[model samples]
Target chain A: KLATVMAIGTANPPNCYYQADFPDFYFRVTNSDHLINLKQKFKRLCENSRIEKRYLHVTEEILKENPNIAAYEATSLNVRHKMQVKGVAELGKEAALKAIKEWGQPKSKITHLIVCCLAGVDMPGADYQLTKLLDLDPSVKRFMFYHLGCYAGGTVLRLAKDIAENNKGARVLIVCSEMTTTCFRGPSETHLDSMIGQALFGDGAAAVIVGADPDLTVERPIFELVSTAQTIVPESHGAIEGHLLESGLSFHLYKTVPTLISNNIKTCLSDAFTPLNISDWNSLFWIAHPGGPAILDQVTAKVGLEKEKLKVTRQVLKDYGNMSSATVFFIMDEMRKKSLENGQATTGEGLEWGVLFGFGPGITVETVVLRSVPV
Target chain B: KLATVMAIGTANPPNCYYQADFPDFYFRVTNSDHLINLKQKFKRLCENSRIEKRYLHVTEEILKENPNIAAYEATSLNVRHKMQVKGVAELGKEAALKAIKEWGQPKSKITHLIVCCLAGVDMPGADYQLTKLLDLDPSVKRFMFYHLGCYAGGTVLRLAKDIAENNKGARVLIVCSEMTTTCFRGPSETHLDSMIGQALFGDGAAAVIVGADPDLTVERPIFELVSTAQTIVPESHGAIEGHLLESGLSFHLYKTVPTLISNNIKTCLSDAFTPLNISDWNSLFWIAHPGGPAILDQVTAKVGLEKEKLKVTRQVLKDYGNMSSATVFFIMDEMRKKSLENGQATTGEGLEWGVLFGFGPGITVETVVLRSVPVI
Candidate 1:
């Protein structure tokens, strides 16, 4: 038995920051009179970020209510960390509730709770908080995958699959919540990394219900998980780093990252595809993580996939900048929506298989194969 | 299929601090002038802690060589965090190398690495560092279990067992490292908790090789993992906590924790033992985490075990205090030593079954059953 995706749900905060006005907001937040050259550089970067708008848990107007927050785009690390703990729980619970509701599964049915988060710290943590909030069974097994960086969505899904396959009658509820907004540092702190991070990341929370129960699949269209594989590029471990800074944890993206992934992805994909004797790319739908436009562009150019294959990924990026780990779920959620809207259920002869990919620190690449199965 | 313990290894720094002098060091570090009452109270607490000495990666004398280290028992969080990162990796590598050597298994043969740590932070973390340090396979599956608190050792071992059982030809390296000494807070903070924490926690690292390959058990007595179980005491989750503070992360222990564990552990043990038909207590040896003296006393009383049953646990606590997740391994290592010293062998019919238990935050109780198996 394999874990099948029963339902997917996602929720974002109310505030939306347009990419067009982000440079102005950046200048205002940094007070860029002294660093005019850097401000122009940031403006150019923002315009080409391929992100039309990004959702944030709080807006500049809200931040302006505080003194130091008005001066910087973020509050102190301690304050921001506290906010993250509270924010992820509140936002994560809403998404999880919606997913559970959609699945028509009671909270108690979730035998395991896997929480993927990198933005916060509390004693009981996101797992315990969500358990209490959702009123899950007290005996439910809890696992927290933290600081795994952007690929945590893929990582947690892989774990859910393993748990369901290993433990009979297991129903795993997976939640990915990230507050990239809380990671914002003043653009002046570093040259390109900070500006790019601020331009590319936003807040998001997503929930997925997956289990080995075939009865649940009889009532809905489910993604039957085929397999999952992970690989890290050798010598490229330093290409991306998430450090615990005095202010808070922040992602430091090296310029060589995109090239490193592009250069090594063929071998990584071969390791994933060769074993399955998968030779035809046309038979598979693609759900690539929108790590950035350049990453998607490089992956598309190298892997030889058609531009239409990444439409969901590109559109998610355009609508809501990279929400780190939650971006993969957001893209997949949309793919499921569009498939249903197009009336392309797997009941027909042309069954669709999907390949999902995500990258994070260690330049680690995680890939999952999904086959669409109709109820 | 079951994961068998191929070998166990442990390591700690050279510096050892006697518990008797801990109060003097505490007073010197905090430099309290007016609080005679609290100072005397701590002196009494330390004298009766049942811990004679604890090991530290860095000593008070060693800290005196550095400017900031002398002022605070712990350096700044960032500085201490960096030190902890390098320390755990360095010490964990040593322990892992010895275990691998003893197992007679090539580093390249290991299929998975499970790293359990809570003292420090680093990207690609201890698992990645060990992968590089040991020059293991780049594609080896890696799992990092962090911040799970003291029971993290039990959690990772259980995971290793599942991995080995689920995958054919899987060899898992399990490492648990804790720098509890680096977690020391100046006694000026919360009165009792800091004093108790300083008196209890120590620095240690342990590594073990576990796999389903029975060939390696021919010449050695190995503990075959029978089963694993975990449970959180209902409504008692808040009794113990690991919280992030301005100075650093601190463990807050409530007075109710010992009582809560003693009250709930009867059922927790039953859940683990009932299915195994483990009614005959005389046939099963026990290895339990000595969270503290009171904890050991309470668990022994509640579980209906004789005082002699916990000799290894009490001795470990007496020697090294509690090393958080690493404490279980210290106890198990001693138990393995005693088993061999008593002439127990896998080749014979006198097969022994033992149970290991650990408790941590969430008031979480983790238990594992093991049976000594002979090679085919």
Candidate 2:
């Protein structure tokens, strides 16, 4: 079974200068973080490999073309950490403090913290900081996770599903924020490899809300989550590696990614379809994680998907590069925008299932079945 | 109303060491960037965060204790080029490629992707990287997301709910990986303010699998997902900012924070729970994301949640240092571990309603309702 999408919205950097004059925010960066000038730096860093300069140049050109265009709002951009913490347990509280301060919303609505990240910064005991940040309220439920990687989206989605499925309906915000920037300096084979990171990534956050009764229509709700799939690669432990090193957190990669991926995806697709009770794989649309290039090639080669099917995904990488879990929403937003443009604005149960997937260090792969429209 | 979680797993730095040895990884730093050694670098990067150096220690420490650790295996960790045109369309395929090669699994199980990160160097059309990489795999659905900051886990979970609820039994894999070192040059006001990112955040990929036909069980599957609530703050522009500049992808920090989370949460919660027909908020268990100490504090203050209630979240932050979308699983892992140890596994779908929430740059807040165990 395939999931249908209800509605989507996207925001991107405008070509011209609309901020100074048209200060009316078409959208805004919700949390707090500094917006660095990445146009030049990114151009210089990615002068090689395969990327084109036109993509980078488009920013200035777009701004020039659309003088009215201003700032594009991001979901969860960056976290604050000017304050110091000594232990991992304190990290969560400290992070929560940062999140609250950045959010600056009325405390009455933020009754819970649904954190989704993979770092050992906050450890042992850091609930006190969270308590204080939340104004000392004692009714919040604190959930944490480990081991799971990108598929955490699926994990958290499952958590949400459980919450929604069991309870009549509740207000819970799923936070997909990651500060992976801290573990960037990997000891790769070449300087270019070590610096490869400097060329390919950025920092940001994504905080979206999902409620039983949302402002949007259930048929054309903002978006709906569906199913999940977790596949394990028993042999490729040497491919994507994540381990603590003397220097810090050490992650590794291999070059033979194409061949390995092509072979592995066959298995994953089988698992995904098995549950859908369908053998027709073409019915499914892919909302993939942008880890790199060759990997995508291999998946397409093995699964036989249409290139046009991933238009928004392609656009996202070209613009934002890779923002990890948040990247998925960017694509969704793009689709949402398209829907609006085409007047795909009917409040109807849009999606049946939206297959979501991502791969991480453990050679671990995760997937989530998504429903197009809200329930 | 609420979503259900069948299974979950993660591959954190510490957890990776716990599952496997440290030698299985190769940290690639070119001569131009090779100033610090591996161990010192590791400690320097992860020292002050929540997830301490327990499983993740200096190379010397691990080697000293277990000399054969390095002998286990080694994988090359590279520094990607900013100009790497691989394209966003190709990212998913690329990630899947790396994942498959690393996991050494067949393509049949390579279902989906869950990309998690903040910024990128030069690539445009990030999701295109998935298509470019996978060549448009018809079998694999591409769900590409970008721009989100940290709390991606909850969003992916929302995706999972759609998958599970829509499909009877499905298997899904999610990935949460980031490359923040590129734009992490000198120091920006935003970077300085968000010092935790500079000191502790790292570039890495994490993947986890979720399935229905449970091959494994942990504490009987406590509370599941019920509903999802999304709240966009009013007039909150430039709060958490990110944009592409000449200096690569620059990020900024502004506005107050988690302090305001509650009010937005209430707006969404009121809507999500209206249909549930529940009044006493204390009846459900809370699975909150530990964005940071302050955000947690604000949430606690707003919700009146018990400090001890966040034991798992706090513990996960201490152990994993916020692996972005992977953080929730860290907390869930703790709870699952506790559930297993306490012999309190769920029985006959006895679990009740639970809520999952996360905030992003929309200065956005996403919430979901969940059930404990599956209805079956």
Candidate 3:
């Protein structure tokens, strides 16, 4: 038996902030107008960021009510975690409902659920909350993964493949819910690691329905999971890191992250594509995690990919920024929509084979070999 | 291919405190002499706990340096989380090394790692730190699980079953580390739920090596993981709950927890044993979670088991009060040791088939069907 992706759905909070006006709005809201030099640095980062707009669960009203959350202080994590426990589930329910509707199966068919979140820590987890909210079966088994950082989206999919292929008639629902409100803070000159977080991170949730031996009368296989692999870049432990500190979720990426991925991605891909014996890189489509503009650029040049091959990757980055673990599925969602609108034979930008890359803490790389079926 | 438990190892902090002296030690250190009646209540709970001794990472010197952690108040979480980040890994490394030694294989053969903790949340995770500490391969696949309360030990093994069986030649190292020090606090008459915690919970870590089709020359299969299942008791969400709050890890269990498990034990076991078709409960051995004396007593009565069926289970709980996720593997480790010492036909008290029960928050029940292997 083989696992296949039946349907995909993604959701972001209703609030969208344009990149052009974000610097002005961000500084004013955080009450940090006095730091003019820091604001100038943030302004430069924004214009060059290539992100046009981003959606967030954090908004004007929420910040106005709780001023401490907007400031950089110790008392912030308590407020942040309380808000995230509820917000993560509410947003996840939206995306899951959309995915369930698209799958066109009754709730009873889902046998297991896996929930991943890079923010917030709680018992009974978001998976428990989702099972109740979706009104799925009480017997549905659940696995919860917390704070695995950026690569968690790909990690969950990799686990879902094993679960679906091994269990008899199992339909596993996998979702990654992230909120920047849990990690957001005011400008900090002392802790330079906190600077890039405000510019790069956004918030959203994505859900996918995966299973083996689908009911073809009602189900369509979007992508067949061919194989999966995971590896760690040697000596890249400190490149990307995050922690649940009292202030909030502490995360930072070193400037050399782009260089580290550039050095290791080829070996990772060479090992993953061994089954098909595929050598030509351009023939395969790409569904990479849009970690940043620089990360995408480094991967493209190193892998010898054409600039147009990553049009959808850039499109997602521009529209949504990096939603951490939820970013990769957004790329998957847009690629199908764009390919279908043009009447392509396959959903993977008209290519038959593709790859999804997940990179995060541990400087870990998780890749899934995807084969898009003919439309 | 079927996944089997190859070897088991467990470790606890060296600081041992007698259950008889814990009440006096706990009250005096927390500076709570004024609440004499509450101390009397704690004294009763400890004496009747069926626990003789418990191990803890928190010592008198450690508590003296920080009075806030001893007293129940705000600003305790930051200190607790930081200490846990270091203590959890240091203790886990001890257990993992011992397990690897018992497995009698090189670390290079390990392909995957799974780390679960009921307390502490971090970025690179305890898995990453364990890889570095144990010097495992850099490319080993890792899965980190946090805050999946009491039943997490069973949950990780259930996951290990799928991961090892799906991939050829894959050996998964699974570990669960817990510490009550993160959630410990002075007695609070206002919060009655906190009372049972002092008397019930202890601290430890457990590690196990799981794989399918092992190299017979180097590896020994202690127990074959026959099958695994999980189900939540209907309408039991509020019976056990924990949250990371300002004061530290806030955990509490309702008094009705033992009663709830008594009500649902038969149905849960009935659904799991469908493959074997064995109905007589007395025919099998048990490796229950040993959550507390009350939890074990109710299961023993409901299942119609002999008093000696849980000999190893009660022994471990008496020595180490409910260490949460790390408690089950301690039972597994002790089961094999006792069976071998007595020259039993199988490690499971001479039984061929057995069951492992994991019950925790979500009122979640994670069960694993087992078949013990004969000693060579």
Candidates 1 onward: DockQ, in order: 0.47, 0.04, 0.77
Per-candidate TM vs. native? 0.94, 0.44, 0.98
**Model 1: share of real contacts kept:** 0.26
Residue A343, model 1: Cα distance from true site in angstroms: 2.5
lDDT of 2 by residue, A1-375 (tens): 122222222222222222221111111211112222333233344543222211111233333333322122111111111111222223334334443343333445544445554433232112222434445334343343332344455555555544443334344444554434233331122322333443444333344444444433222344555555454455554565443222223334566545666678767767766777865544554667666656666677667776655555666666565545555755655655565565643211132445666666445566666555422
Rank order (by DockQ, best first)? 3, 1, 2
Per-prediction fnat: 0.26, 0.00, 0.72
* Position B166, candidate 2: lDDT: 44
State residue A54's C-alpha deviation in candidate 3, in Å.
1.3
Model 1 TM = 0.94
Flag regions of model 3 displaced more than 4 Å. none
Q: For candidate 3, lDDT tens digit of each residue in B150-230?
A: 888789889999889889999999888888877988889988788788888898999999999989988999998988888
- Report, to 2 decimal places, the DockQ of model 2: 0.04
| Rank by lDDT (best first) | 3, 1, 2
Alpha carbon deviation, residue B164, candidate 3 (Å): 1.0
